[PDB]
Motif scaffolding. Structure first.
Motif, PDB file in Angstrom:
ATOM      1  N   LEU A 108       0.856  -1.264   0.000  1.00 32.30           N
ATOM      2  CA  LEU A 108       0.000   0.000   0.000  1.00 32.30           C
ATOM      3  C   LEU A 108       0.857   1.266   0.000  1.00 32.30           C
ATOM      4  CD1 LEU A 108      -3.297  -0.290   2.155  1.00 32.30           C
ATOM      5  CD2 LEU A 108      -2.860  -1.173  -0.162  1.00 32.30           C
ATOM      6  N   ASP A 109       1.662   1.457   1.048  1.00 34.13           N
ATOM      7  CA  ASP A 109       2.560   2.603   1.079  1.00 34.13           C
ATOM      8  C   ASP A 109       3.701   2.187   0.157  1.00 34.13           C
ATOM      9  OD1 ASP A 109       3.870   5.215   2.475  1.00 34.13           O
ATOM     10  OD2 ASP A 109       2.059   4.770   3.630  1.00 34.13           O
ATOM     11  N   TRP A 110       4.125   0.927   0.250  1.00 34.22           N
ATOM     12  CA  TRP A 110       5.226   0.452  -0.598  1.00 34.22           C
ATOM     13  C   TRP A 110       4.874   0.384  -2.066  1.00 34.22           C
ATOM     14  CZ3 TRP A 110      10.253   0.015  -0.852  1.00 34.22           C
ATOM     15  CH2 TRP A 110      10.800  -0.720  -1.930  1.00 34.22           C
ATOM     16  N   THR A 111       3.681  -0.080  -2.324  1.00 32.62           N
ATOM     17  CA  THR A 111       3.275  -0.233  -3.685  1.00 32.62           C
ATOM     18  C   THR A 111       3.422   1.090  -4.407  1.00 32.62           C
ATOM     19  OG1 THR A 111       1.716  -1.810  -2.717  1.00 32.62           O
ATOM     20  CG2 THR A 111       1.536  -1.385  -5.097  1.00 32.62           C
ATOM     21  N   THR A 112       2.975   2.146  -3.759  1.00 36.77           N
ATOM     22  CA  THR A 112       3.035   3.468  -4.336  1.00 36.77           C
ATOM     23  C   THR A 112       4.469   4.035  -4.419  1.00 36.77           C
ATOM     24  OG1 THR A 112       0.794   3.729  -3.532  1.00 36.77           O
ATOM     25  CG2 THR A 112       2.021   5.743  -4.105  1.00 36.77           C
ATOM     26  N   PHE A 113       5.169   3.940  -3.304  1.00 29.57           N
ATOM     27  CA  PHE A 113       6.543   4.397  -3.178  1.00 29.57           C
ATOM     28  C   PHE A 113       7.375   3.859  -4.363  1.00 29.57           C
ATOM     29  CE2 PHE A 113      10.710   3.942  -0.839  1.00 29.57           C
ATOM     30  CZ  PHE A 113      10.931   5.297  -0.731  1.00 29.57           C
ATOM     31  N   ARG A 114       7.246   2.575  -4.588  1.00 30.79           N
ATOM     32  CA  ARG A 114       7.978   1.921  -5.638  1.00 30.79           C
ATOM     33  C   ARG A 114       7.577   2.423  -7.019  1.00 30.79           C
ATOM     34  NH1 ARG A 114       5.898  -2.287  -7.381  1.00 30.79           N
ATOM     35  NH2 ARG A 114       6.826  -3.774  -8.951  1.00 30.79           N
ATOM     36  N   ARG A 115       6.291   2.696  -7.157  1.00 22.76           N
ATOM     37  CA  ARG A 115       5.713   3.171  -8.387  1.00 22.76           C
ATOM     38  C   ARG A 115       6.414   4.482  -8.752  1.00 22.76           C
ATOM     39  NH1 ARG A 115       0.422   4.997  -6.981  1.00 22.76           N
ATOM     40  NH2 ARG A 115      -0.238   2.895  -6.305  1.00 22.76           N
ATOM     41  N   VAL A 116       6.383   5.425  -7.819  1.00 23.08           N
ATOM     42  CA  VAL A 116       6.976   6.760  -7.968  1.00 23.08           C
ATOM     43  C   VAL A 116       8.484   6.834  -8.317  1.00 23.08           C
ATOM     44  CG1 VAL A 116       7.488   8.956  -6.696  1.00 23.08           C
ATOM     45  CG2 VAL A 116       5.250   7.793  -6.442  1.00 23.08           C
ATOM     46  N   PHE A 117       9.314   6.092  -7.591  1.00 15.45           N
ATOM     47  CA  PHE A 117      10.754   6.126  -7.828  1.00 15.45           C
ATOM     48  C   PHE A 117      11.306   4.952  -8.632  1.00 15.45           C
ATOM     49  CE2 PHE A 117      10.015   8.466  -3.779  1.00 15.45           C
ATOM     50  CZ  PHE A 117      10.599   9.673  -4.075  1.00 15.45           C
ATOM     51  N   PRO A 167      10.445  -1.181   5.807  1.00 15.04           N
ATOM     52  CA  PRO A 167      10.323  -0.838   7.227  1.00 15.04           C
ATOM     53  C   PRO A 167      10.492   0.678   7.515  1.00 15.04           C
ATOM     54  CG  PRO A 167      11.505  -2.881   6.966  1.00 15.04           C
ATOM     55  CD  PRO A 167      11.446  -2.251   5.611  1.00 15.04           C
ATOM     56  N   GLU A 168      11.146   1.401   6.611  1.00 11.08           N
ATOM     57  CA  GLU A 168      11.333   2.837   6.785  1.00 11.08           C
ATOM     58  C   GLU A 168      10.030   3.579   6.574  1.00 11.08           C
ATOM     59  OE1 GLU A 168      13.935   4.928   7.788  1.00 11.08           O
ATOM     60  OE2 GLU A 168      15.122   3.124   8.189  1.00 11.08           O
ATOM     61  N   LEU A 169       9.122   3.013   5.787  1.00 10.48           N
ATOM     62  CA  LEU A 169       7.856   3.673   5.519  1.00 10.48           C
ATOM     63  C   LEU A 169       6.938   3.799   6.742  1.00 10.48           C
ATOM     64  CD1 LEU A 169       6.949   2.320   1.967  1.00 10.48           C
ATOM     65  CD2 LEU A 169       8.401   4.201   2.554  1.00 10.48           C
ATOM     66  N   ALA A 170       7.180   2.988   7.766  1.00  8.52           N
ATOM     67  CA  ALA A 170       6.379   3.052   8.991  1.00  8.52           C
ATOM     68  C   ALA A 170       6.741   4.260   9.875  1.00  8.52           C
ATOM     69  CB  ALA A 170       6.539   1.762   9.794  1.00  8.52           C
ATOM     70  N   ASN A 171       7.897   4.876   9.636  1.00 11.76           N
ATOM     71  CA  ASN A 171       8.338   6.029  10.428  1.00 11.76           C
ATOM     72  C   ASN A 171       7.653   7.284   9.922  1.00 11.76           C
ATOM     73  OD1 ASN A 171       9.798   8.233  11.674  1.00 11.76           O
ATOM     74  ND2 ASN A 171      11.693   7.056  11.673  1.00 11.76           N
ATOM     75  N   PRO A 172       6.927   8.004  10.813  1.00 12.50           N
ATOM     76  CA  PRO A 172       6.223   9.244  10.467  1.00 12.50           C
ATOM     77  C   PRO A 172       7.216  10.245   9.848  1.00 12.50           C
ATOM     78  CG  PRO A 172       5.548   8.525  12.596  1.00 12.50           C
ATOM     79  CD  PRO A 172       6.782   7.735  12.252  1.00 12.50           C
ATOM     80  N   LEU A 173       8.477  10.161  10.262  1.00 12.81           N
ATOM     81  CA  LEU A 173       9.511  11.031   9.709  1.00 12.81           C
ATOM     82  C   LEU A 173       9.755  10.739   8.194  1.00 12.81           C
ATOM     83  CD1 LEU A 173      12.275  11.521  12.516  1.00 12.81           C
ATOM     84  CD2 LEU A 173      10.451  13.175  11.812  1.00 12.81           C
TER      85      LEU A 173
END
Length: 228
Positions: A1-10, A22-28
């Motif tokens: 979900l967050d990864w699916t998109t992240f990967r799409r973009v870059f 695992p980095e995507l879970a950090n609000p930062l």
């Protein structure tokens, strides 16, 4: 979900999913991404979006043999392409890179050097060339150094070292030495001054390329052909 998109973009290679997701879970990480997006809308950001994570495409985490840490990406158009120190093919190597290539030639007199400065060949052969800051505003060095890239990249490198004992790390200069501190008992940690022609010690005297290959050999890994 967050990864699916992240990967799409870059356009990130899925093989890196376990080290990055695992980095995507950090609000930062969301703050970092939103800031990067805002900067792309207001300034000329380098390297191009499609090249920011080019380093994930040349080899998988399991194929990584050597890690070389960089600081900031080149800030003039057409130079940076996502790998630390490397410039696009047909861009004459700038001063610091010329010194890195001179040291390779001093270590390996038989190496056939092309005269170019693109290090894609090394990347495909397991040499991970990673900057601690992945983007920059055109013409302004260290302009994106405080938005949080170093935190994200540090996490990825920690997970890699944790998963892969026996990696060779090449840390050139004070920044790289302070940024990453792998366990010297588990990995081969090599340190030297920066390649810049302004350094007091001439980088051409560095023997890291040779020492790395001897280490790999004592561990039954094929040596890296450093010619480029």
């Amino acid at each position: 979900l967050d990864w699916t998109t992240f990967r799409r973009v870059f356009l990130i290679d899925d093989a890196w999913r376990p080290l990055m997701e695992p980095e995507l879970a950090n609000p930062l990480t969301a703050h970092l991404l939103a800031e990067y997006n805002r900067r792309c809308q207001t300034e000329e950001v380098l390297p191009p979006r499609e090249d920011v994570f080019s380093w994930t495409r040349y080899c998988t985490p399991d194929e990584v043999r050597v890690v070389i840490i960089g600081q900031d990406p080149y800030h003039h158009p057409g130079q940076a392409h996502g790998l630390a120190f490397s410039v696009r093919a047909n861009v004459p190597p700038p001063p610091s890179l010329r010194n890195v290539l001179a040291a390779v030639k001093n270590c390996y007199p038989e190496a056939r050097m092309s005269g170019h400065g693109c290090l894609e060949k090394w990347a495909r052969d397991g040499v991970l060339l990673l900057n601690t800051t992945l983007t920059v505003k055109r013409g302004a060095a260290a302009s994106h150094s405080r938005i949080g890239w170093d935190r994200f990249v540090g996490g990825v490198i920690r997970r890699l070292a944790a998963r892969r004992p026996g990696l060779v790390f090449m840390l050139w200069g004070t920044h790289a030495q302070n940024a990453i501190r792998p366990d010297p008992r588990v990995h081969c940690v090599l340190k030297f001054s920066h390649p810049s022609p302004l350094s007091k010690v001439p980088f051409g005297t560095c023997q890291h390329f040779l020492v790395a290959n001897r280490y790999l050999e004592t561990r039954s890994i094929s040596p890296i052909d450093w010619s480029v």
